[PDB]
Design goal:
heterodimer, A: mainly beta, 2 domains, B: Immunoglobulin-like, Immunoglobulin-like, six-stranded antiparallel beta sheet, 20 strands, 2% helix, immune system, mper, antibody, neutralizing, dimeric
Chain lengths: 212, 235
């Protein structure tokens, strides 16, 4: 991107946090900030030198220096858990506009919970269809951020992997799923397959073998 | 009261054409700057183009990846904003917004031509560009076992594989079983087809007695599937 933002930032409930936007154009231009929740229209939070739209809570405020612009939230609430985008010119003096990659803000309001992991081997039913899918289900963890890595035997598996973005459960804990697409030949040609879920620096691993 | 309503979104083949509409009300539309913004699935907001007012001669600017294929226009007499897209590509998905655009310029520290910001937004409209044809899902069982069981509870589910287009709705035991159920968001494979999973945690005790059937519904292909999930026989 031309405007760089943090991929994700976290903050304790009721505390202050600052997410930034950096770009050469910002040296000459001001940035605007937008909140975005899934299935809801974006909202302008801040723009110009010191401009906040009426209706936007005062805990939102923007600042700038050099090639960086910052959005600060003083006293984060539970609802503030959302995506945040900065916008400005792509170059100095440009008539075009552009957005940053956006930052996913996590507001921490619950105890950490270790992920519950279950790895399903390809069903006999599916294998008859000349297909094979390893299903790695992850549930009951907090906060909602995980890294999934697959292993064929001891070696890492690059392609065939598909992973969803974590979503809220009924109990406000998060859940995610990962899929490894194999051909029945590949599936039967290895001794075992493993699903490695990394959550908050710790890694949990589940394994299945074709001999079943 | 500012209102913005996008429409015209739908399915279209690569290389096809599509025109989006945006009806505006509650502000001076004649002199208002209007901007189209799109959010690809699982990605962020991307600036598409903007159309100015009478002062700058209704001039239009486009994002580089889109220029030459997209055209922005307006009809002030009925308060409509248009985005006309030709030779659509897959990347041109998926959710398009129109936004009332304000202009900002600080005379003492600012640099021309100032900045453009987006005061009001519509709900958006969804554009899907794929060569894929409508397909019903293949449903496979995620059978529970010792490996799927921990702490007196077990996990079982359904694999809803290779369907198009979205969405799929999944229930368990005709809606009776709702506790412990979680249906995952679909994933989009390189083939252009969707797949998702629906899991429910149940007491280990119940496995022997209770029956578990997932109900898969896919209205785009008019397909209903009742699939029973029971523990696999090792034999």
């Amino acid at each position: 991107y031309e405007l760089t933002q943090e991929t994700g930032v976290s903050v304790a409930l009721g505390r202050t946090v600052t997410i930034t936007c950096r770009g050469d154009s910002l040296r000459s231009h001001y940035a605007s900030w937008y909140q975005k929740k899934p299935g809801q229209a974006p909202i302008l939070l801040f723009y110009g030198k010191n401009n906040r739209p009426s209706g936007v809570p005062d805990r939102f405020s923007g600042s700038a220096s050099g090639n960086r612009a910052s959005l600060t939230i003083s006293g984060a609430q539970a609802e503030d858990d959302a995506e945040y985008y900065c916008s400005s010119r792509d170059k100095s003096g440009s008539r075009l506009s552009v957005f940053g990659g956006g930052t996913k803000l996590t507001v921490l309001s619950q105890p950490k919970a270790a992920p519950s992991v279950t790895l399903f081997p390809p069903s006999s039913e599916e294998l008859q269809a000349n297909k094979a899918t390893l299903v790695c289900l992850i549930s009951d963890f907090y906060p909602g951020a995980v890294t999934v890595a697959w292993k064929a035997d001891s070696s890492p598996v690059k392609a065939g992997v598909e992973t969803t973005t974590p979503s809220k459960q009924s109990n406000n804990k998060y859940a995610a799923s990962s899929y490894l697409s194999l051909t029945p030949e590949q599936w039967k040609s290895h001794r075992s397959y493993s699903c490695q879920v990394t959550h908050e620096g710790s890694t949990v691993e589940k394994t299945v073998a074709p001999t079943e | 009261e500012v209102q913005l309503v996008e429409s015209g979104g739908g399915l279209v083949k690569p290389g096809g054409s599509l025109r989006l509409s945006c009806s505006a009300s509650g502000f001076d539309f004649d002199n208002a700057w209007m901007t189209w913004v799109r959010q690809p699935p699982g990605k962020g907001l991307e600036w598409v183009g903007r159309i100015t007012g009478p002062g700058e001669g209704w001039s239009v600017d486009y994002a580089a990846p889109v220029e030459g294929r997209f055209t922005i226009s307006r009809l002030n007499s009925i308060n409509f904003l248009y985005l006309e897209m030709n030779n659509l590509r897959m990347e041109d998905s998926g959710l398009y917004f129109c936004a009332r655009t304000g202009k900002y310029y600080d005379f003492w520290s600012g640099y021309p031509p100032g900045e453009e910001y987006f005061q009001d937004w519509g709900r958006g409209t969804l554009v899907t560009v794929s060569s894929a044809s409508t397909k019903g899902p293949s449903v496979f069982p995620l059978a529970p076992s010792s490996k799927s069981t921990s702490g007196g509870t077990a996990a079982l589910g359904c694999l809803v594989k290779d369907y198009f287009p979205e969405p799929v709705t999944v229930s368990w035991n005709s809606g009776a079983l709702t506790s412990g159920v979680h249906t995952f968001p679909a994933v989009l494979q390189s083939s252009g087809l969707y797949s998702l999973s629906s899991v429910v945690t149940v007491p280990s005790s119940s496995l022997g007695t209770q029956t578990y059937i997932c109900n898969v519904n896919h209205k785009p292909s008019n397909t209903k599937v009742d699939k029973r999930v029971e523990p696999k026989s090792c034999d």
